[PDB]
């Protein structure tokens, strides 16, 4: 099972854990943490306007993102 309680920890964790890896998508974040799917793409969309992640090629199922360098 995957937790979905917004206990103020997930948002801070993902914001400080994005630089750990380069490829960010629903398939890898499920392995990374117990994410139920909604926050999986909501967090990525909310971090898109920030300069942390750079887009490469977006698709309906998934979108490709890379780190700052």
């Amino acid at each position: 099972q995957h937790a979905t309680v917004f206990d103020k920890s997930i948002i801070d964790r993902i914001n400080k854990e994005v630089p750990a890896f380069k490829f960010i998508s629903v398939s890898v974040l499920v392995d990374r943490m117990k994410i139920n799917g909604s926050l999986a793409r909501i967090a990525i969309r909310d971090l898109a306007e920030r300069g942390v992640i750079q887009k490469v090629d977006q698709h309906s199922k998934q979108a490709i993102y890379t780190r700052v360098p």
Binding site: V26, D31, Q62
Partner: protein, 203 residues
């Protein structure tokens, strides 16, 4: 130079770079594992894996087919998807770019090394005709080696991604990278070892 049409410079730069792959170089990749030359068209550069041509008219016409195209053809399994080449091409493209993102070397080189390492060397055919119905150790041809490697990789990817969150492209990429090197975590390599050990046992 440009015309009224947009004509993006990516295509022009690709033509200047001796028509490399979609996002990977073509000049500088060759089969390094011995005993599998003259049967994989690594040098035949094609912008897309798909090629609607004749691949079964001759006895050995299959040897000149693109290795990526043959793998897309192997991925055509599961008659639910028998005939959906666009899905297979997208999955292969996503797997290849994920491999490039993971490791810097050419994903085609990863692919060639994976199929070469997976390809069985010693098999065991059945004598039949009742009696002791035993089996004898027999070697196999390079073309059948590629066929076994392609089938084992595809069936392993389907089994791994049959029921899981991970995508088919990701599972295929994981299988290819795990088969290109020796890590003992590849289902295709396990079947390779199993076929070898049973062949030596009945030899």
């Amino acid at each position: 130079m440009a015309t009224s049409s947009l004509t993006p410079g990516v295509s022009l730069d690709e033509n200047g770079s001796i028509k490399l792959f979609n996002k990977f170089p073509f000049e500088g990749v060759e089969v390094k594992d011995i005993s599998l030359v003259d049967y994989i068209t690594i040098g035949n550069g094609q912008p897309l894996p798909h090629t609607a041509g004749r691949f079964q008219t001759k006895r050995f016409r299959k040897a000149r087919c693109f290795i990526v195209e043959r793998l897309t053809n192997s991925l055509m399994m599961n008659g639910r998807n028998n005939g959906k080449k666009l899905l297979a091409t997208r999955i292969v493209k996503h797997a290849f770019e994920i491999i490039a993102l993971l490791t810097d070397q050419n994903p085609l080189q990863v692919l060639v090394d994976a199929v070469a390492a997976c390809g069985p060397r010693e098999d065991s055919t059945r004598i039949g005709s009742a009696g002791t119905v035993r089996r004898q150790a027999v070697d196999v041809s390079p073309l059948r080696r590629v066929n076994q490697a392609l089938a084992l990789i595809t069936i392993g990817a389907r089994e791994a991604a049959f029921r899981n969150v991970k995508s088919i492209s990701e599972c295929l990429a994981e299988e290819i990278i795990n088969a290109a090197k020796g890590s003992s975590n590849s289902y295709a390599i396990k079947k390779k070892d199993e076929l070898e050990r049973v062949a030596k046992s009945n030899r």
